[PDB]
Amino acid sequence: ELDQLRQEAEQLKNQIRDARKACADATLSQITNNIDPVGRIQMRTRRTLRGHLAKIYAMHWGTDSRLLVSASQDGKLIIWDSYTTNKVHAIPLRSSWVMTCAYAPSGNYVACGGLDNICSIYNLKTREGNVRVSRELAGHTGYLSCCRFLDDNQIVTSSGDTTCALWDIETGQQTTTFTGHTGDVMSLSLAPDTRLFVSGACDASAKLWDVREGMCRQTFTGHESDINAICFFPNGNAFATGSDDATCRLFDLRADQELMTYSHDNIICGITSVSFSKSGRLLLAGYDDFNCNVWDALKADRAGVLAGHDNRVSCLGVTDDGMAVATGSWDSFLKIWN
Amino acid sequence: DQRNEEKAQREANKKIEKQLQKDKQVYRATHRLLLLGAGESGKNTIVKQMRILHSGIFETKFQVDKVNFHMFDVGAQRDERRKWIQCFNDVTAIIFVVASSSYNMVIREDNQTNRLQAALKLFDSIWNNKWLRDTSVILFLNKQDLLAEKVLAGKSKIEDYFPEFARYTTPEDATPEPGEDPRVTRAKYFIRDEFLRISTASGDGRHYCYPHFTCSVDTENIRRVFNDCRDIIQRMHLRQYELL
Amino acid sequence: TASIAQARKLVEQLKMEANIDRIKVSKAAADLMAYCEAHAKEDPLLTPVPASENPFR
Amino acid sequence: ATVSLWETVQKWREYRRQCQRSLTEDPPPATDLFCNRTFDEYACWPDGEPGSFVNVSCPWYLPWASSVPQGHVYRFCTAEGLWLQKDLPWRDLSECEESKRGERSSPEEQLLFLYIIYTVGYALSFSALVIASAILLGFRHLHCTRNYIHLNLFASFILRALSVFIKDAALKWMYSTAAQQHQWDGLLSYQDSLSCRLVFLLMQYCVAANYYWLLVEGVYLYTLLAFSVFSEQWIFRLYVSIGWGVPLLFVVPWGIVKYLYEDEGCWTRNSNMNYWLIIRLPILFAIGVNFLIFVRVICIVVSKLKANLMCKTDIKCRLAKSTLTLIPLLGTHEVIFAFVMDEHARGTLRFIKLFTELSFTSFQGLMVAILYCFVNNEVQLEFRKSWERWRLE
Numbered sequence A: 001e002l003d004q005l006r007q008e009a010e011q012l013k014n015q016i017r018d019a020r021k022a023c024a025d026a027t028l029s030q031i032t033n034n035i036d037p038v039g040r041i042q043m044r045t046r047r048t049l050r051g052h053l054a055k056i057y058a059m060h061w062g063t064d065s066r067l068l069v070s071a072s073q074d075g076k077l078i079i080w081d082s083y084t085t086n087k088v089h090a091i092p093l094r095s096s097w098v099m100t101c102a103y104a105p106s107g108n109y110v111a112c113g114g115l116d117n118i119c120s121i122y123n124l125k126t127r128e129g130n131v132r133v134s135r136e137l138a139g140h141t142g143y144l145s146c147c148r149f150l151d152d153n154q155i156v157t158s159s160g161d162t163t164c165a166l167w168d169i170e171t172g173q174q175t176t177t178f179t180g181h182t183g184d185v186m187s188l189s190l191a192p193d194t195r196l197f198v199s200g201a202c203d204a205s206a207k208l209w210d211v212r213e214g215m216c217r218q219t220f221t222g223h224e225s226d227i228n229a230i231c232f233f234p235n236g237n238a239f240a241t242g243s244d245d246a247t248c249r250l251f252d253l254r255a256d257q258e259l260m261t262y263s264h265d266n267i268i269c270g271i272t273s274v275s276f277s278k279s280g281r282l283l284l285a286g287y288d289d290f291n292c293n294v295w296d297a298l299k300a301d302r303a304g305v306l307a308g309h310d311n312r313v314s315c316l317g318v319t320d321d322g323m324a325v326a327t328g329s330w331d332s333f334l335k336i337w338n
Numbered sequence B: 001d002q003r004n005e006e007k008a009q010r011e012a013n014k015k016i017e018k019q020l021q022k023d024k025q026v027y028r029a030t031h032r033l034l035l036l037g038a039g040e041s042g043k044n045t046i047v048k049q050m051r052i053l054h055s056g057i058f059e060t061k062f063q064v065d066k067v068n069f070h071m072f073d074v075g076a077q078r079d080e081r082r083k084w085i086q087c088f089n090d091v092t093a094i095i096f097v098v099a100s101s102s103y104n105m106v107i108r109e110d111n112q113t114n115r116l117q118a119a120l121k122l123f124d125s126i127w128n129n130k131w132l133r134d135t136s137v138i139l140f141l142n143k144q145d146l147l148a149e150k151v152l153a154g155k156s157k158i159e160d161y162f163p164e165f166a167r168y169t170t171p172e173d174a175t176p177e178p179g180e181d182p183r184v185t186r187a188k189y190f191i192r193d194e195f196l197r198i199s200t201a202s203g204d205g206r207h208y209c210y211p212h213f214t215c216s217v218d219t220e221n222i223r224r225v226f227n228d229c230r231d232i233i234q235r236m237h238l239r240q241y242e243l244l
Numbered sequence C: 001t002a003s004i005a006q007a008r009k010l011v012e013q014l015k016m017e018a019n020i021d022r023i024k025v026s027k028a029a030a031d032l033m034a035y036c037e038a039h040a041k042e043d044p045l046l047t048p049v050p051a052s053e054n055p056f057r
Numbered sequence D: 001a002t003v004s005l006w007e008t009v010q011k012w013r014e015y016r017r018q019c020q021r022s023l024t025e026d027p028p029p030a031t032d033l034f035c036n037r038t039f040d041e042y043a044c045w046p047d048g049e050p051g052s053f054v055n056v057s058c059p060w061y062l063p064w065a066s067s068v069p070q071g072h073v074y075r076f077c078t079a080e081g082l083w084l085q086k087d088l089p090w091r092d093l094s095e096c097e098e099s100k101r102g103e104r105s106s107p108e109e110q111l112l113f114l115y116i117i118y119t120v121g122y123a124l125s126f127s128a129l130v131i132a133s134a135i136l137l138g139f140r141h142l143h144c145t146r147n148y149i150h151l152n153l154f155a156s157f158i159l160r161a162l163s164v165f166i167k168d169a170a171l172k173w174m175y176s177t178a179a180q181q182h183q184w185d186g187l188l189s190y191q192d193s194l195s196c197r198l199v200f201l202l203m204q205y206c207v208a209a210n211y212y213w214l215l216v217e218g219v220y221l222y223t224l225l226a227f228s229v230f231s232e233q234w235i236f237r238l239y240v241s242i243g244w245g246v247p248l249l250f251v252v253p254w255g256i257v258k259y260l261y262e263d264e265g266c267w268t269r270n271s272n273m274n275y276w277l278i279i280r281l282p283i284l285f286a287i288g289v290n291f292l293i294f295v296r297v298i299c300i301v302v303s304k305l306k307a308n309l310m311c312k313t314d315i316k317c318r319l320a321k322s323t324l325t326l327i328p329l330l331g332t333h334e335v336i337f338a339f340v341m342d343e344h345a346r347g348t349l350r351f352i353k354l355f356t357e358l359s360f361t362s363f364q365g366l367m368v369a370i371l372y373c374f375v376n377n378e379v380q381l382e383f384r385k386s387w388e389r390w391r392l393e
């Protein structure tokens, strides 16, 4: 009976509610009252990478922390050399509605995805090193929103069909499908150990997934609207979200409950992309008001603004070595901050 | 070597930036159109005519008097068009197709929802979207010939489905085509004014609505899109010079 | 009908969520800062790195 | 009103020519102990008897020679063979004077006021236009093809104002409106000097370039509203060429025909032939084409306004505003000024007719700068954007 099972779930929600409430004794803000504040941080746009015709949604820093890839609505992929500002490759795409891009951790592959519902795997190091596509992953039945390579042969993709997936590129068929979300999944982040990953969806909830088991290990709630972005802390024991309600929240896997809130009264536009720093002290978030804010992760204070973009900021990334921060926007310009 | 590296990159760069110029002389001369309509609205029949004359995304390309058009149809199962409607803020126009005869019909018995009221509900959400506040909507009232059949005493559907219709009189500026009964005109301009009520209040000087009494078999639908896209561009330039 | 299985899977998924090892929030905060103090010196953007070391100058 | 110091000096020029010829080729008097004939910038005294008055008819270049056709001017040569030194030797020119000016403000005192007004107008236009060019070049987001055309139009206006400044400052006629006889020699040797001709030619070219850049504004706006698609680079370069180097096609031929068949003067309209056509005809052609473009554009605007559901008199409130702000961009007052101009007038009359139109069309640069840069809602919002970024800091 639906009434019986729904009433059991209603009660079982209460037990988990008290389970999280039991572990809450001291707030993160109260303990971080003694630590030294970060102070006002000023960054400047060192390089500015131009050439895209239409607006941009995605960018992903390389493993060497020098290269990166940019996907734009004009149906183009473009690879950059953030040091010399010179381009490397300009790969035209088949569908002109691309919503995400990725860069392989080995530096060999880049992947895009969008309204075409297809995940395209591009090999950079090839005889031509060009439009020749290595694999066209299909089967999502919904617009693909975010892709992040576990390896050269495994890539996790989140789509609007409310289900995430793990793709064996050689076979081309999704090895494991992650279901449980009720709304469209917008962003996903890989853990550093790459044994777990987290996804935030339109249902205003985040879920922790075991890439090997395939089960929703944990489920985090609290946001009042769609989660547009998500990333892990560098240690792998935490992650932060970016939602449409103009709030960023820090969760904990081990504590299983929300830790910190990153909000300001004079912010009204929803966050589009978030990322963390090398030490995890700084949480950078890209908003719709054309300015990327810089947050002190431990104290929730705001210590800097990267206000240099003409149109909406859509993507955001911090290098693996922590040297630089890239920003893409709807004005079709990439801006490297340092 | 390292000298040649920058000479290799700048030559690799010079190939990248030249082709991006040629692709900039196509993206600017191309008019991108988004089709938003119900499944049983004749939208697919309209697409068929526009393509032959010249799975989440569907495209097509037709040139009208040396003007490029790129039309995108998005088959969507979710009721929430959001999170993919943002990607169309830069399209030149949205072609909204409505089956006018579909009054008194329900959507596969789903919530016994009237298909006409569903189209009005869909139109209002797209016309009042923050991301599409500058994009104009070319409205197509498609199933006109089927509408005439029911209006002339078919099942005595007097549009009593729409109550305010009894309080309707045809405006004098309405242009009746020859061969059209006065009773048909009372129905057509009631349905059109039902939509024009939505568009008139929401936004002015940012984006307009261009109603048309098309038919699925009509070949003038391509021409109506061309003339409306010409007027949309012209109204944009006149606003740039602050002449409107 | 068929929604019994769907509601059944919801209860199972919700049960594995109830029985997990959950630490105090105090230890959660304490071991989050320790990662920052350990890598504060290594952080390039936190402590201003000298222009001589920046590759973006 | 019809004659001023200009034609007095131009008559004195030919009078000096005739008297120089007379002095060179008058036969020497048979008797010796004569009295040397000379031209003292005022009268033309022939060789005279000693100890006898010299009767010279009053010269025909003076503007007041109508009232004294019987007048004479006098010099007394002495019995020792020389004129009568007063302390120029003694001359009694009372018999040919000028009548009193009965509270009349001559064309000089009017041309001075017109000069003041149009120099002030070009000063304000120059200042507003350099500020507007700074604004349009500073903000990087305000970089469109239409804004490049606006910048070129601003440059044409600035160059025309500067050329007028240089012309007026080079020949300081602002003070020489009361120049006496001794100042007319320099006033005439400057006119037929190369510097005056080159300054006039440069001013002519700047005028033509300003007209053709208003025409280019009109043509670009027409191509936008005609829903025409062309290779914009290959069209921006074409418009730049039309606006700058097409006046060269009818200014240097005019310069050559005024350098090959003109002996004296600072390249003012000829006395017998019709050489001004090479300059004034294409200016009229550009003004006419641009007026046709203005007609088409206002027709498009009225069609758009009538398309909307608009009230009867709000229509005119917006129709007037769209037309008023369109006059400075195309220069549609220069059809009225082209119709009220006399193309066959010369001299002081022509100067006054040009100076009134200059006095009115000077503020056109100021109006263009105000309308298309300073009150431009894009420029205002860019100002707000760049002053909220200091509110972040």
Ligand SMILES: N#Cc1ccc(COc2cccc(C3CCN(Cc4nc5ccc(C(=O)O)cc5n4C[C@@H]4CCO4)CC3)n2)c(F)c1
Binding pocket: D004, D005, D006, D009, D010, D108, D111, D171, D172, D173, D174, D176, D177, D178, D187, D188, D191, D196, D200, D266, D267, D268, D269, D348, D350, D351, D354
């Ligand atoms: N000889 C001699 C002479 C005689 C008198 C005085 C002083 O008294 C008077 C009296 C009346 C007018 C004036 C000034 C009024 C005008 N400017 C200079 C001047 N601007 C011109 C603009 C357009 C045109 C045109 O045809 O399109 C032609 C233009 N011209 C005349 C010639 C052309 C270059 O200079 C010259 C003088 N000044 C003197 F300064 C020189």
